[PDB]
A paper describes a structure:
Several lines of evidence implicate the human activating signal co-integrator complex (ASCC) in AlkBH3-mediated DNA repair. ASCC3 is the largest subunit of ASCC and was characterized as a DNA helicase that unwinds DNA by translocating on one strand in 3’-to-5’ direction. ASCC and alkylated nucleotides co-localize at nuclear foci upon alkylation damage stress, dependent on a coupling of ubiquitin conjugation to ER degradation (CUE) domain in ASCC2, which links DNA alkylation damage repair to upstream ubiquitin signaling via the RING finger protein 113A9.
Here, we mapped precise interacting regions of the two largest ASCC subunits, ASCC2 and ASCC3, and determined a crystal structure of an ASCC2–ASCC3 complex comprising these portions. Guided by the structure, we delineated segments and residues that are critical for the ASCC2–ASCC3 interaction, which include a large number of residues that are altered by somatic cancer mutations. The importance of regions for the interaction scales with the degree of their evolutionary conservation. Our structural analysis revealed that ASCC3 and Brr2 share at least some structural organization in their NTRs as well. Based on our crystal structure, regions neighboring the ASCC3 plug-like domain are expected to be guided away from the ASCC3 helicase region when bound to ASCC2, however, ASCC2 did not alleviate ASCC3 auto-inhibition. Correlation of the evolutionary conservation of ASCC2–ASCC3 interfaces and the contributions of these regions to a stable interaction underscore the functional importance of the complex we structurally analyzed. Based on these observations and previous insights into the role of ASCC components in DNA alkylation damage repair, we suggest that reduced ASCC2–ASCC3 affinity might contribute to malignant transformation.
Author numbering:
A (entry chain A): -1 to 186
B (entry chain B): 2 to 215, 227 to 408
Write the structure that this text describes.
């Protein structure tokens, strides 16, 4: 238990903050209220729904767009089931974009993707995850591999174009370690 | 012109229907309603069920922090000042995040990648809050800024120590700037440090009192005590010395505050009391646990090295560095402080021997002798003859 490990700043906090150590006598009250409000906390992911259908229409012929629109409707229906209709149209469209991006490089439903959808929208029917994954793989089956790399580059670029404070700053993950000394020699 | 944030006004609607009143920029309900959960460190071995609990909590924290860094200057500062969950989340991370020198397992790359994300994001958040001039338009009045800092508990003394030991090896020059800036803009942290020093020293005596070394009725010496109680003692000591040393490596201006509490002597005598007994006990009981006792030996030697480095940092900052600079030739008090410090630990022969081995005393005495126009051997001879005899007691 690492919450147990004896630390100087732990002792320092305990001495003047008796108050606060069992102030955090909070567990799933703590995380639950987070789940309560996480519904609108995700604005968007890498690529929004409008960006996705722009890409699809820009890269594929009308021939295959005909079928891809039914696939996208399957994804929209799956998002409707997962997101729910009371948050509204744009919410289920961003959920559909999240679904598409979840499965655009994966051909099956895995522990990672179920857990990701649950993290984003709470518990959900996995049948809809299957439906959305099937529709997404149907769509990607029309991509050429140049098209697929274009999509990957587009996701990577927009994630890279995000700006946050201290983004371009130099940063080191080197942390203070034990200095190397030498083993207690052999006794006797 | 550019108006600093603390005094800038933004128009907002009041409770009354269709009525606009100008009001300060920073305000409780201009803060966002994003909840912040506390941070818990990963399990000690890669138990799948525990790993995913940690992963859930950690992704909440990391997503919130990514968004917080995305926020603008006005709304980010509103959030940090008025959302108590945020500050408590950051305190949680600083208090509980595993340090590298801790006993560490390799774990799945998911936990490693996530931990790296959290590390970088937390450092950048603390940079943002340490800076009072994000840029030309977005800045805060120095006097108002330090008030904000101290007083929404944004910076503790423990949080500063944590910050240094966590980010000081790699990102030193930046963290120097941060810590120096918060101490400059709000000097009451010095006092905070002051009030914290009695507790810090108390730590050391507790260690002594726990090994029966020195109202705790006779506890067992390290040779007798149960193994993992000894493990905890030296783990606590190692964490304590590393944290103190890292703090003084980032912010050496603190040293005088330390020496006001007779720190050089306290750690010298603690060294004398604690180090020999624990050394002998670890050596004797090495075969009770081959691997554990060697790790404890590594940690003990690391702690001794860090203690002596602390000693020398303080000595230099309050005597040697002032002499080298600013040589208007009024350095007697500095010289006298040096001499007093060593006169008070002449008898600590084991500490003297090791300390001289690492930072030779003769080399620092010659600094005083060079700087003073009028320094006779009388004033330092005994100190050297202490050092000599300290070595002569042992066969090297």
């Amino acid at each position: 238990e690492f919450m147990a490990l004896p630390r100087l700043t732990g002792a320092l906090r305990s001495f003047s903050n008796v108050t606060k150590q069992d102030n955090y006598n909070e567990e799933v009250a703590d995380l639950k209220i987070k789940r309560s409000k996480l519904h609108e906390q995700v604005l968007d992911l890498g690529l929004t729904w409008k960006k996705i259908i722009k890409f699809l229409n820009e890269k594929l012929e009308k021939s295959k767009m005909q079928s891809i629109n039914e696939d996208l409707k399957d994804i929209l229906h799956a998002a409707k089931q997962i997101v729910g209709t009371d948050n509204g149209r744009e919410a289920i469209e961003s959920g559909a974009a999240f679904l598409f991006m979840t499965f655009h490089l994966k051909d099956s439903v895995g522990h990672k993707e179920t857990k990701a959808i649950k993290q984003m929208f709470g518990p959900f029917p996995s049948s809809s995850a299957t439906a959305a994954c099937n529709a997404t793989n149907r769509i990607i089956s029309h991509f050429s591999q140049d098209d697929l790399t274009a999509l990957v580059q587009m996701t990577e670029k927009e994630h890279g174009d995000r700006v946050f404070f201290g983004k371009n700053l130099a940063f080191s993950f080197d942390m203070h370690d034990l200095d190397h000394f030498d083993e207690l020699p052999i006794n006797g | 012109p550019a108006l600093p944030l603390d005094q800038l006004q933004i128009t907002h609607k009041d409770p009354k229907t269709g009525k606009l009143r100008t009001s300060p920029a920073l305000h409780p309900e201009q803060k966002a309603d994003r909840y912040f959960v506390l941070y818990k460190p990963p399990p000690k071995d890669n138990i799948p069920a525990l790993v995913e609990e940690y992963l859930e909590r950690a992704t909440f924290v990391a997503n919130d922090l990514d968004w917080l860094l995305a926020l603008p200057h006005d709304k980010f500062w509103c959030q940090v000042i008025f959302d108590e969950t945020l500050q408590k989340c950051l305190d949680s991370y600083l208090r509980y995040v595993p340090r590298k020198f801790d006993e560490g397992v390799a774990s799945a790359p998911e936990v490693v990648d996530m931990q790296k994300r959290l590390h970088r994001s937390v450092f950048l958040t603390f940079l943002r809050m340490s800076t009072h001039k994000e840029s030309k338009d977005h800045f805060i009045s120095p006097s108002a800024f330090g008030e904000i800092l101290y007083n929404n508990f944004l910076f503790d003394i423990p949080k500063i120590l944590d910050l240094c030991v966590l980010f000081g090896k790699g990102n030193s020059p930046l963290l120097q700037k941060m810590i120096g800036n918060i101490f400059t803009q709000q000097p009451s942290y010095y006092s905070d440090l002051d009030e914290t020093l009695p507790t810090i020293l108390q730590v050391f005596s507790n260690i002594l009192q726990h090994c029966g070394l020195q109202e705790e009725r006779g506890r067992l010496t390290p040779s007798d005590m149960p193994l993992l109680e000894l493990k905890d003692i030296v783990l606590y000591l190692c964490d304590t010395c590393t944290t103190l040393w890292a703090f003084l490596d980032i912010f050496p201006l603190a040293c005088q505050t330390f020496q006001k509490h007779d720190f050089c002597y306290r750690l010298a005598s603690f060294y004398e009391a604690a180090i020999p007994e624990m050394e002998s006990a670890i050596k004797k009981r090495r075969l009770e646990d081959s691997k554990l006792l060697g790790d404890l030996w590594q940690r003990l030697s690391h702690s001794r090295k860090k203690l002596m480095e602390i000693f020398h940092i303080i000595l230099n900052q309050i005597c040697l560095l002032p002499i080298l600079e600013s040589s208007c030739d009024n350095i007697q008090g500095f010289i006298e402080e040096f001499l007093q410090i060593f006169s008070s630990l002449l008898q600590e022969k084991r500490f003297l021997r090791d300390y001289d081995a690492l930072f030779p005393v003769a080399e620092d005495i010659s600094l005083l002798q060079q700087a003073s126009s009028v320094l006779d051997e009388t004033r330092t001879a005994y100190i050297l003859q202490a050092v000599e005899s300290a070595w002569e007691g042992v066969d090297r």
